[PDB]
Amino acid sequence: HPSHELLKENGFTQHVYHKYRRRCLNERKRLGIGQSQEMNTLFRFWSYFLEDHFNKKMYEEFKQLALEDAKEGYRYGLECLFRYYSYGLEKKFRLDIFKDFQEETVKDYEAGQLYGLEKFWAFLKYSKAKNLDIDPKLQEYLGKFRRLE
Ligand SMILES: C[n+]1cn([C@@H]2O[C@H](COP(=O)(O)OP(=O)(O)OP(=O)(O)OC[C@H]3O[C@@H](n4cnc5c(=O)[nH]c(N)nc54)[C@H](O)[C@@H]3O)[C@@H](O)[C@H]2O)c2nc(N)[nH]c(=O)c21
Numbered sequence: 001h002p003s004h005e006l007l008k009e010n011g012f013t014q015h016v017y018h019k020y021r022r023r024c025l026n027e028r029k030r031l032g033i034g035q036s037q038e039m040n041t042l043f044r045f046w047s048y049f050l051e052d053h054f055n056k057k058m059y060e061e062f063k064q065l066a067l068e069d070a071k072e073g074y075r076y077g078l079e080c081l082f083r084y085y086s087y088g089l090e091k092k093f094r095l096d097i098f099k100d101f102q103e104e105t106v107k108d109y110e111a112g113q114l115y116g117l118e119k120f121w122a123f124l125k126y127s128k129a130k131n132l133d134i135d136p137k138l139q140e141y142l143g144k145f146r147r148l149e
Pocket residue numbers: 047048051080083084086087088090118119122123126127
């Protein structure tokens with residue numbers, strides 16, 4: 001499957017990604033939100049590829065579609081996103097992606113979820129990055145979560 005072939009070292013091509021990307025989006029557009037298994041393989045592919053091959057275009061599309069699915073109750077996309085955040089920022093830290101991470105974590109917790117908040121807590125726990133400027137709201141929620149975890 002392309003989602004596993006494009007992850008191989010030096011095994012990526014826009015020729016293959018264009019085809020793979022279109023089948024996924026079409027099946028999604030055709031079968032509907034959270035109905036395309038091929039679209040879930042694309043969420044997964046983005047979660048790993050963007051770690052060592054960050055592309056702004058891919059990332060903005062990854063985040064947009066993940067939030068769409070999540071707004072209707074399908075969370076695998078948003079789960080893949082928080083995974084890319086938690087592990088991707090641990091390998092290569094980017095301030096602009098770190099702020100997106102905080103924004104989406106706040107949104108996830110305010111929607112009654114804890115998956116995102118655990119992944120952000122996990123990031124602070126393993127990256128050991130100190131003097132991180134954390135949004136005041138997210139500090140309060142992390143406090144509630146440390147009491148939980
Ligand atoms: C070792 N480790 C653990 N955590 C965190 O701490 C908690 C431990 O419980 P846990 O590990 O038992 O998670 P689960 O309950 O099984 O479910 P779940 O956590 O949902 O599953 C773990 C997922 O991580 C994903 N994973 C492993 N490596 C990678 C990677 O390189 N890239 C991406 N995008 N995902 C990865 C994998 O797909 C898997 O579904 C979990 O929240 C862990 O995430 C870590 N977080 C960071 N930032 N870095 C780490 O090295 C790390």
